[PDB]
Every structure is written in C-alpha cells, then in structure tokens.
Amino acid sequence: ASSHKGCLQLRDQSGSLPCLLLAKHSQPLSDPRLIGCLVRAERFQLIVERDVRSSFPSWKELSMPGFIQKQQARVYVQFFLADALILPVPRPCL
Amino acid sequence: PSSGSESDLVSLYEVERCQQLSATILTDHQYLERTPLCAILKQKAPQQYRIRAKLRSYKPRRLFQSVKLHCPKCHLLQEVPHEGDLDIIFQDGATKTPDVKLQNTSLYDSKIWTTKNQKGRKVAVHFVKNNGILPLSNECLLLIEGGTLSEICKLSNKFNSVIPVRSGHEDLELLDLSAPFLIQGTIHHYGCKQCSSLRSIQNLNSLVDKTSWIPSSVAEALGIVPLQYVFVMTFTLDDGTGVLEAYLMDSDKFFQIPASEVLMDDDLQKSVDMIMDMFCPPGIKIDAYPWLECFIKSYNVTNGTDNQICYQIFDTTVAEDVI
Amino acid sequence: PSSEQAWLEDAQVFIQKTLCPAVKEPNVQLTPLVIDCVKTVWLSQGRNQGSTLPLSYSFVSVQDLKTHQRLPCCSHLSWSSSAYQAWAQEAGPNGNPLPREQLLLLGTLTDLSADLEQECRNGSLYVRDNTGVLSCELIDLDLSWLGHLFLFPRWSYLPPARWNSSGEGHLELWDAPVPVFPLTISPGPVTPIPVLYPESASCLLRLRNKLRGVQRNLAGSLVRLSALVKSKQKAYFILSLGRSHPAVTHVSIIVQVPAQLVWHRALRPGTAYVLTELRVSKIRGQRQHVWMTSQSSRLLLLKPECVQELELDPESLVRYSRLLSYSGAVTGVLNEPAGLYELDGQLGLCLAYQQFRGLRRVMRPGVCLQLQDVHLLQSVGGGTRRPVLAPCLRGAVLLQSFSRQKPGAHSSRQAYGASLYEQLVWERQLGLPLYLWATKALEELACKLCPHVLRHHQFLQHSSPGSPSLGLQLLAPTLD
Amino acid sequence: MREDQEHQGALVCLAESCLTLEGPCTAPPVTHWAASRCKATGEAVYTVPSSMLCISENDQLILSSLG
Ligand SMILES: [Zn+2]
C-alpha cells in the first residue's frame, strides 16, 4: 500500500504497476494483514485508457496522423483473490 | 506540466521501514539508535549518527574520476597524473648520457644499450646488489634511466620492483617525483613534492635489509613521502525525512576494492561500476533503489569564512551477497 | 653456504620435517633420492640451461599450500614461460591460463581420505604428507602407484570456491609421478590365468546354473560401463567385456566392494582386462544376471602369455533418442549449479541424470572428454535451439584432458542452488525437455525478486520439511 | 663464474627482451577507466577541497571523545 495515493501498487524490479483487487465476486478486500505478501496471478486482465487530445478539423483528416496533439496512457490490472495465490515471504533472516 | 505534476509526486521516496533488505552494513557502532536526517539537520556539528538512506544520486557519475591520491602529512588530496604526464617526464631521460662512475659500484652494477630507430635513444640499466651480490629476480631491485613508461612497467612486472632515475653528478637520483618513485608491477607509487626531501640511491644503505624492498622502507631511504590511494565521492543520501550529502574518502574499506590497483586492473573497475549502478540503477525510479544503512560523522569546515558544515561516511561496507 | 648449498640444506630441512614419513626416521638417505629426481627432470631437459640443482623452484607442503594459497596455480615443472605458453595456449586460442609457479610438490598418494569415521572410500583419491591431506584428480591413472611416495612433476592446484562450504581445493596432474623410493621392480602373472572367455561367460550370465568347475575369472575388451553409481549406503559401477566387436557376446560385471571402488578411476574403453575371484548375482528384478566382485577379487590388464582361455512426428511429437558415443571439449557453461554445458558450442550437453557431483569441481572450458552410450535428442522443449546430449546411468563420462584454463569469477547469480535443480530431477522425476524450461523459469524469477526482495540462498535453497523453497512453490501449480 | 654470469645474464635477458632494442614504439594494453579517461580528456575533473574533508582536527578530537 503506497504512501502517496493509497492505491494498492505492485512493485518489482524495473518499476511498478497499479492494481485493483476484489476478494470475491461482489465483495471487497477487507483485512490489512494482506499487505506485504507475494501474489501469483494468472487469470487476470490488463487494461489501458488512452487519453488522446487530438485536434482534427473534419472527419476527412481522421485518415491521417498529422493532427494529434498529445498522448498518455494509464495502465493497470485487476483480478479476484479466488484466482491468484498469496505467498507470505518468510520473515527474511540469515 | 500534465504528466510532470504527477511525476513530481510519483517519484517521491516512500517511508522508512520497507520489506526489502539493506544494501550496506556498518562494521561498528551498531548499538547506535537510528537518527532521522531531519533530526540531524536540526542539531549542531560535529556529532556521530547512524542512518538509513537511499542514494538519490552520486558524484562523479563518470566513475573513472572516483579515485584520488592523498598526502596525509599535509592532509591535502592530489590529482592522479596521466600517462601523457609520465611520457612528458620520461622523454627527457631518453637523451641523457650515462656516466662511467655511476655504472658499477659496491651497491649496484649496470648494463647499457642504444635503441636503434628511436631517434638514437640512450638507455642504461642498473641492478642493485644484496650484501654486494646480485639477488634473485624476486628480490632484485632494478634501476632505469632512459626507459619509457610502458617499458619500465613491463620490466617491473618481471623484477621485484624498479625505480626511475637519472644521472646525478654524485649518484643516481629520481628523475622527477611527477614520475613514480617506485613502480611495482601494477602499482605506480607517487609522493608529495611539498612534503618530500629526497636522497640519492646510495642512501639505500640506510635500509634494515636489501631483500624485502618494502615500498615504505625504500621511500624513507630515498627521503620521499608516499601518497595514499583513496576513493573519493559524494552521495545524495535521501531518507524522506530529509536528504543529506556526505563525503567518502578511504582506501579499500567500503568498496572492499584496493584503491591502489583499481586504476590498472579492469576487473576491479567493472566491479566498482557494477556496485555503483546497483546502488543507483540506470533510469528507474528511486522507488526501486535499495536501502542503504551506514554510519556518518558531522563536522565544520569554514573554508568560506564560516560554516560550510559537512558530513563524511565511516566504518561501513557493502554487504557480501549483494556484490 | 653457497646458493646451491643453501638451497640444498633448505631442501634437507624440508624433507626431514615436512616430508619424511612417520613410518620412517627423518632419513637423510631419502634426500639424495629426491635430489636425484629433481636433478634428473631438470637436467634431462637440456633446455633448462641451468645449475645442476634447480635453485629457482622451491618446496611446498600440503598444509602449507592449503593455508597460504587460494589462486589457481600451475607447476609446469622445469618448463620455461615459452614452453609453458606452448602448453597452456594449446587449450587456446585465448584460453585464460593458470599462472606459472616454480614450486615442487612431494607427498604420499592414497585413496584413503583424511576422515576416519569409516573407511570413507567413496571412490575418492588423495595426497598426504606430514602436514596435511588434499584430494586430487589424475588422468590416465595407474593404480599400482597407490600407497607410494613420489615427486610430482607438471602439477596444478585449483583453489576452493567462494560458494562452496567445504572450502577444499583439489589437485590436477599432467604426468606420471616419480617415486622417491628406488624403482620397485616386481614380478607379474607368469602363469596363464584361468579365465572364462566372453562367449561362455555370457552364456553363464543367462544360464547362471552352470557356474561350476570353470574358474570364476574373466577377461575381454571393455565395451560398456556405467558411471560410478551410488546407493544411500552401497556404491558400485557396472562394466562389460566383449570377445571383440561386433561380438556375439559381452559379459556384464559389477564392482561393489568399498575398498575396490577406486578401481573405477583406472579402466578405459576398448582396452582388454582381466578380472578374478568372481561370482554371478541376481539383483532385485534384474533377470539378466551379472558377474560381481568378491572379498578376494582382483582386476588386471590382459596380456597374451598371461591368460588361460576357458570354454564350456508433426502429428505426434513423441520422438526418439539416438544412442551414440562422443568425444571433444566443452567450451563454456550455461548454468554450473544445474549442469548445462556447450560441447564445442555445436551441441547441447546436459549432465543432470547422473550422481554427477564428482564432476562439478573439474568441469570448465577447455576440458576434453569422451562419452559412452549417451542419449541424443533434438527439437527439445523450451524452444531451445541446439541438440542436446544427456548421459544416463547406462552410460559413462571419461576425461580426455584437464584444462589449462583457470576458472572464471564468482557471482551469486550464477553459482548457487545446485541442490534445488537436483531435487527437482530426483523427487519429481521430470523429463529433460521439461527440465530445460524448469531452469529458464527460476532463472527469470531470481531476476525479479533477488537479491533485493529476497537473497538467493534464501530463494533457491533446497526445499526442506522445515521450510518450502519459494523457488519450488511458485512453479508447482504450472508444473504439477 | 658460470653461475654468476648465468644469473647476471638472466637479468640482462629480462632487461633486453623488455627493452625496445630496435624499431618503433608500441602501444600497451589499456583498461576501461584508463581508455575512458583518455577519451574524456578535456573534461574538468571532479574534485573537493580537503577542508570540506575533515581538516578540522578539533572536531576530530571532540568526536573521538564521544562515546
Ligand atoms: Zn604533502
């Protein structure tokens, strides 16, 4: 659970990826005990949200590229906790 | 800036006790309680502290600039000469004429050559003798005048250790302390001109022995203050509570790499580059930079009249498994 | 005293104390013997162009070496850096060599390990002096040398490895040892030994009933042999002799007495041998019987006057291994703790399905080897490109030559976790085309987690009831 | 004199075989940092005054006094 925005983030080498759990269909995740662990997920979905802000004059130009002004792209995942597996990193020690 | 305003938040540090494992261990003063960086800033200097941080950045990034020569007697760093400098020194010896009374003595004997095609360069070699007798190669101290840096280096890879010299009217003398006062295989020894008061080769008679040729011993005999090899760098130690810019200045402690040989051995250079790019991986966010625990001291400076308060690292080494 | 005389008196002290065996006084009569050995090998060069006594070289004990040294080192005894290079870089081009060092090694040679909890045979071999004991490896070994005391020429030491707990180096040898003890000429088997020839012997391997009268000895050319197999207590390895080849019959045999285990190191294929004082056994469910060694068995080489012959698919990817035998040189490593190697680069080479452990501490680029009866597979799993050899117990691995190349660097990313790959193979019993991928996976997980979120020797440790290995749990659902 | 001349000649052989007796000079091997420095030559090198690096022996004293 990240300090800046609360949003549950997945973090591993090279960076991070936001996520959106759900305990089970139509019920939310509910115990803090689950922060810290490893979750192995294989039946999941990957999303995007293109936030283009082009400036096309007419429908004609839609055939061309020379009118887009900006671009961004949210990206994140979502899955139930009936599918993924939780693994508790055994408290690291020598 | 649309995404810049968010990056200004997304790149922030996080807190002070994560899951991930430290990257450095302090060898001493482990009993010391962790002191937040902010708490330190609000206090006077000097003082000892034990902290945890992440290297937000480090200097110099161009890591071939991370080693220095240091003279302890006058505690003042010294830049390392270049090979071009050594060549500018040695070039003046290539044209010198050997003297007959400097050839064979009770202490050293010689052999001469004239290298062809090399503008008529003159070269002379002298072999120091133990108790009047030439010792085996592993203990054979050899002297050169007219040899180039590469030649004296390759020759020092073979003999015990070698001293560049020139024809002194009384006796052989170091041609220039800008050149090595002793080159020992991969180690070029340099001295502080401001603190040295050198002597001639005959003064090797002051040595306790003529077989070990300990660089310190021969330096003292030739009246030269040997310079120390050290790593020196400064690091941006971020803690979230605050960010601190300390100094590093040591020989073979933290890195566990010989600052004396790292310049001439490529494996060590690969190793140090790996270590620094591991503490500070290229490009990715400090969000993924590893924690670094260490022990630091604080002190005053006043080089600009007053304050210039500063911090230096001590008694800390990279963990074993993360090398 | 003179330089040569000082060298000689130093050698005198060294012999007396470091070398002179506890069984015999610090006898000075030994010193001329070793002096003659060093003189012989040194002057017989001619190229030495040296003093009568090689003053440049020096004397080093086992314990001395053990404490002091930790680099790889080569005593290419009595050779110049030119001749050294000519030998070292014959394993080239760019074969990163051992260093040339002027040391002399003198010691007793035995199979007996330094441990006395048992006999501790384990097919192991060792050098022993008054100071310490150290294990060794020896190409084209001669067993007669057991128990004898020698000078060792052209010898090399490999240091222990950072990852390794036992922290033991080992010796490698390039030429026969010279005994300090004067030539111990001894007689041989004059009488033609009564042995069963391979046809009658094999008929007996089928008809175990007829083992009477004809002496329980054997002879023939070694056609087939296993690697040295180990049970949890028993250790053994199987061999087979043929009258010729292609021959109608071959006589399979098993060595199994612990004291005899060392025998395994000596034999070589094709060469013809003689075995003695045997029986035939019926191992559990192994209906094709084999000859076996007794408390009194002995093994010997075969010689004409020394024998007395005695006669009474794209649609179904299930694909086939091609049995063969091969030789060459490895040229790299792809995963030392698991066991993958590149034979001349052209052909993949695993080694997992052996007991294997004995080969680890040797195997490195520039090693020359021979394989007998070894499966070859193609189009293997994990999308891997090259073909792959993969010895198995019914085969055996043989050294052609030690490598002049020194070992490479340590790095936790590469060096750890052998026990885990091994545990997979033997507890789960995968098939190689799945094992290749079951490597590439853990090689990708330890690229995310380790060392930062978790260190190798926590992640890859062999799973134990006291704790499951994360390097096993993560794979389990896909694997099982 | 055989041994003495042999020894002095070994020394002289090392020396002469190392000496460029004739012909032009040659380039020795160069390591990563050395070649990189040479390529970067023209760069102003990172450096720090020794004052900022604990020239204050008084602070050193009262520091070592601390427990
Ligand atoms: Zn100075």
D: neighbours with 3+ CB pairs under 8 Å?
A: B, C
- What span, in angstroms and rounded, lies between the C-alpha atoms of C355 and C190? 40
DSSP conformational letter for D43: B
- Largest interatomic CA distance in chain C: 86
The two three-digit tokens of residue B278, written as one number? 């591991």
Contacting residues for C13 by C-beta, under 8 A, at least 6 apart:
none
- What span, in angstroms and rounded, lies between the C-alpha atoms of B136 and B132? 13
Closest-CA residue to A39 (of A90, A83, A3): A83
Cα torsion angle, A46, A47, A52, A56, sign: positive
The continuous run of DSSP H or E covering B54 comes out as strand B47-59
Cα torsion angle, B21, B24, B27, B32, sign: negative
Q: Is the separation of the CB atoms in C250 and C242 below 8 Å? A: yes
Q: Is the separation of the CB atoms in B24 and B317 below 8 Å? A: yes
The two three-digit tokens of residue B48, written as one number? 């000892």
- What span, in angstroms and rounded, lies between the C-alpha atoms of C400 and C362? 12
Which of A3, A69, A75, A89 would you mutate first to test chain B, the one with the most B CBs within 10 A? Answer: A3
Q: Which residue of D has its CA nearest to B73?
A: D55
The two three-digit tokens of residue B255, written as one number? 């890195």
Which of B18, B19, B21, B278 would you mutate first to test chain C, the one with the most C CBs within 10 A? Answer: B21
Amino acid at D14: L
- Residue C26, preceding peptide bond in cis (omega within 30° of 0): no
The dihedral region occupied by C461, where left means phi > 0, alpha psi between -120 and 50, and beta the remainder, is beta
A86 touching C (Cβ < 8 Å): no
In chain B, which residues have their Cβ closer than 8 Å to the Cβ of D55?
75, 301
- Do A and C touch, counting CB pairs below 8 Å (3 needed)? yes
- What span, in angstroms and rounded, lies between the C-alpha atoms of C363 and C342? 11
Residue C430: CB atoms within 10 A of its CB come to 16
Q: Which residue of C has its CA nearest to A37?
A: C453
Closest-CA residue to B268 (of B22, B61, B64, B55): B64
Q: Tokens 């052998």 appear where?
A: C418
CB contact under 8 A, D46 and B82: no
Q: Which residue of D has its CA nearest to B125?
A: D15
B12 touching A (Cβ < 8 Å): yes
CA A26 to chain centre: 19
- What span, in angstroms and rounded, lies between the C-alpha atoms of C4 and C265? 40
The two three-digit tokens of residue C318, written as one number? 């299930």
Q: Which residue of D has its CA nearest to B122?
A: D21
In chain C, which residues have their Cβ closer than 8 Å to the Cβ of D6?
49-51
SS3 A34: helix
Amino acid at D7: H
Q: Tokens 């108790």 appear where?
A: B131
Q: State the resolution, in angstroms.
A: 4.1
In chain A, which residues have their Cβ closer than 8 Å to the Cβ of B15?
3
The continuous run of DSSP H or E covering B127 comes out as strand B121-128
The two three-digit tokens of residue C235, written as one number? 């250790």
How distant, in Å, are the alpha carbons of B273, C211, C477 from that of B199?
A: 40, 93, 77
Contacting residues for C397 by C-beta, under 8 A, at least 6 apart:
C227, C351, C354, C359, C369, C370, C371, C372, C391
SS3 A14: coil
Q: Is the separation of the CB atoms in C5 and C52 below 8 Å? A: no
The C-alpha angle with vertex C100 and arms to C96 and C102, in degrees rounded to 5, equals 165
Q: Tokens 């509570």 appear where?
A: B241
Size of interface A-C (CB pairs under 8 A): 23
Nearest-CB residue to B150 (from D22, D28, D54) = D28
B303 CA to centre of ligand 1 in angstroms: 19
How distant, in Å, are the alpha carbons of A29, B122, B146, B214 from that of B143?
A: 79, 15, 10, 16
Amino acid at A17: L
Q: Taking a contact as any Cβ pair under 8 Å apart, which residues of chain C between 390 and 449 contact chain A?
A: 447-449
B: neighbours with 3+ CB pairs under 8 Å?
A: A, C, D
The continuous run of DSSP H or E covering B53 comes out as strand B47-59
CB contact under 8 A, A72 and B15: no
Residue A74: CB atoms within 10 A of its CB come to 10
Closest-CA residue to C270 (of C220, C236, C227, C226): C220
D5 touching B (Cβ < 8 Å): no
Residue B142: CB atoms within 10 A of its CB come to 22
C367 φ, ψ to 5°?
Answer: -80, 135
Inter-helix orientation angle B266-279/D32-40, to 10°: 80
Q: Is the separation of the CB atoms in C435 and C377 below 8 Å? A: no
- Largest interatomic CA distance in chain A: 67
The C-alpha angle with vertex B7 and arms to B5 and B12, in degrees rounded to 5, equals 115
Q: Tokens 């053994």 appear where?
A: C236
Q: Is the separation of the CB atoms in C450 and B278 below 8 Å? A: no
Inter-helix orientation angle B149-156/B83-90, to 10°: 100
Q: Is the separation of the CB atoms in B146 and B124 below 8 Å? A: yes
- What span, in angstroms and rounded, lies between the C-alpha atoms of C363 and B17? 44
Q: Which residues of C357-390 are buried (b: 16+ CB within 10 A; e: fewer)?
A: ebbebebbbbbbbebbbbbbbeebbeeeeebbbb
In chain B, which residues have their Cβ closer than 8 Å to the Cβ of A72?
2-3
Inter-helix orientation angle C30-43/C3-14, to 10°: 130
DSSP letters spanning B245-287: EEEEEESSSSS-S-TTTTTT-HHHHHHHHHHHHHHS-SSS-GG
In chain D, which residues have their Cβ closer than 8 Å to the Cβ of C3?
3
C51 touching D (Cβ < 8 Å): yes
The two three-digit tokens of residue C85, written as one number? 């290079």
Q: Taking a contact as any Cβ pair under 8 Å apart, which residues of chain D between 22 and 51 contact chain B?
A: 22-26, 28, 31-34, 36-38, 40-41, 43, 45-51
Sheet strand arrangement including B161-164: B108-115, B121-128, B141-145, B161-164, B182-184, B187-189
Closest-CA residue to B299 (of B43, B35, B29, B78): B43
How distant, in Å, are the alpha carbons of B43, C74, C161, C386, C444 from that of C430?
A: 63, 41, 29, 20, 19
C271 touching D (Cβ < 8 Å): no
D4 touching C (Cβ < 8 Å): no
Distance from CA of C454 to the nearest CA of B (A): 7
CB contact under 8 A, A13 and C473: no
C324-329 vs C368-374, strand pairing mode: antiparallel
Distance from CA of B193 to the nearest CA of D (A): 17
Contacting residues for B67 by C-beta, under 8 A, at least 6 apart:
B80, B229, B230, B231, B232, B259, B262, B263
- What span, in angstroms and rounded, lies between the C-alpha atoms of C456 and C464? 16
B134 touching C (Cβ < 8 Å): no
In chain C, which residues have their Cβ closer than 8 Å to the Cβ of D3?
3-4, 51
B267 touching C (Cβ < 8 Å): yes
B298 CA to centre of ligand 1 in angstroms: 25
Q: Which residue of C has its CA nearest to D3?
A: C51
Closest-CA residue to B215 (of B179, B185, B189, B180): B189
C463 φ, ψ to 5°?
Answer: -55, 140
Q: Is the separation of the CB atoms in B140 and B160 below 8 Å? A: yes
Give chain C as a 3 state SS string. Answer: CCHHHHHHHHHHHHHHHHHCCCCCCCCCCHHHHHHHHHHHHHHCCCCCCCCCCCCCCEEECHHHHHHHCCCCEEECCCCCHHHHHHHHHHHCCCCCECCECCEEEEEEEECCCCCCCCCCCCCCCEEECCCCEEEEEECCCCHHHCCCEEEECCEEEECCCCCCCCCCCEEEECCCCEECCCCCCCCCCCCCEEEECHHHHHHHHHCHHHCCCCCCCEEEEEEEECCCEECCCCEEEEEEEECCCCCCCEEEEEECCHHHHHHHHCCCCCCEEEECCEEEECCCCCCCCEEEECCCCCEEECCHHHEEEECCCCCCCCCCCCCEEEEEEECCCCECCCCEEEECCCEEECCCCCCCHHHHCCCCCCCEEEEEEECEECCCCCCCCCCEECCCCCCEEEEEECCCECCCCCCHHHHCCHHHHHHHHHHHCCCHHHHHHHHHHHHHHCCCCCCCCCCHHHHCCCCECCECCHHHHCCHHHHC
| Method of structure determination | cryo-EM
Residue C412: CB atoms within 10 A of its CB come to 20
Query: How many Cα atoms sit within 13 Å of C306 on the Cβ side?
Result: 17
D63 touching B (Cβ < 8 Å): yes
Nearest-CB residue to B21 (from C409, C412, C455) = C455
The C-alpha angle with vertex B76 and arms to B70 and B77, in degrees rounded to 5, equals 45
- What span, in angstroms and rounded, lies between the C-alpha atoms of C218 and D59? 88
- What span, in angstroms and rounded, lies between the C-alpha atoms of C194 and C192? 6
- What span, in angstroms and rounded, lies between the C-alpha atoms of C8 and C27? 15
- Do A and D touch, counting CB pairs below 8 Å (3 needed)? no
Q: Is the separation of the CB atoms in B53 and B255 below 8 Å? A: no
Radius of gyration from C-alpha coordinates of chain B: 25
How distant, in Å, are the alpha carbons of B205, C98, C168, C335 from that of C158?
A: 42, 9, 9, 20
The two three-digit tokens of residue C279, written as one number? 């029986």
Distance from CA of D3 to the nearest CA of C (A): 7
Contacting residues for A92 by C-beta, under 8 A, at least 6 apart:
B19, B21, C454, C455, C458
The C-alpha angle with vertex C130 and arms to C127 and C132, in degrees rounded to 5, equals 55
Contacting residues for C291 by C-beta, under 8 A, at least 6 apart:
C201, C205, C216, C218, C251, C252, C253, C254, C275, C278, C279, C280, C281
The two three-digit tokens of residue B247, written as one number? 């100094």
The continuous run of DSSP H or E covering B221 comes out as helix B215-221
- What span, in angstroms and rounded, lies between the C-alpha atoms of C285 and B237? 70
- What span, in angstroms and rounded, lies between the C-alpha atoms of B297 and C235? 62
The two three-digit tokens of residue C316, written as one number? 């179904």
Distance from CA of C361 to the nearest CA of A (A): 27
Residues present in chain B in total: 323
DSSP letters spanning B136-199: PGGG-EEEEES--HHHHHHHHTTSSEEEE-B--SSS-B-S-TTS-SEEETTEEE-B-TTT----
C3 touching D (Cβ < 8 Å): yes
- What span, in angstroms and rounded, lies between the C-alpha atoms of B222 and B191? 11
Query: How many Cα atoms sit within 13 Å of A28 on the Cβ side?
Result: 3
CB contact under 8 A, B3 and A72: yes
